[PDB]
Amino acid sequence: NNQLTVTNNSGVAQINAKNSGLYTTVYDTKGKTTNQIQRTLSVTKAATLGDKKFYLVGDYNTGTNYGWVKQDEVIYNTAKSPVKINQTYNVKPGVKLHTVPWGTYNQVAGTVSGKGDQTFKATKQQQIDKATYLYGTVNGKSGWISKYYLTA
């Protein structure tokens, strides 16, 4: 009959406001509603059950699995494994930090403030499709900033 195919995948995603909910099991007939929309979530696995297609989504900073979500009900993006780095960067005031790479408005960690260019000390970096996001600290606030907003 219908067989299930669960391969490993690492693609971060954000559930659209129009969704069938979070399926507890790929075999479930109905998805359970979730307020977890327009947020960057971590993808750990991709599944195919006949004509259905899901992504296993969880919280990025804890690894807590939330559930399975229809692939077509999310904006997906590949996520290369993060790497350790040590580099200081110049960042202008007004630039937003996010709690996760490629975060949404629900995921702001703070804003850069001061007189003239502030100092951002990076510790990790991560590639999301083609964009590189760097995790570091500016004036006590820790967070993710895209390389576009940083200058060497």
Give dist(CA 124, CA 16) in Å, integer: 28
Contact 21/45 with Cβ under 8 angstroms?
no
Spell out the residues 6+ positions from residue 99 whose beta carbon is closer than 8 angstroms to its own: 60, 61, 107, 108, 109, 143, 144
Contact 92/118 with Cβ under 8 angstroms?
yes
Please tell me whether residues 48 and 96 are part of one structural domain: no
Q: Show the domain range for 51.
A: 1-81
Question: Solved by what technique?
Answer: X-ray
Buried b / exposed e along 37-48 (16+ C-beta atoms within 10 A): bebbbbbebbbb
CA angle in degrees (0–180, nearest 5) for 84-89-93: 125
- Counting the structural domains of the chain, the total is 2
Residues in the chain, total: 152
Please tell me whether residues 113 and 56 are part of one structural domain: no
Domain boundary among 20, 51, 81: 81
Cα 58 off chain centre by: 10
136 bridge partner residues: 122, 143
Domain boundary among 29, 49, 81: 81
Give dist(CA 97, CA 134) in Å, integer: 10
Please tell me whether residues 101 and 73 are part of one structural domain: no
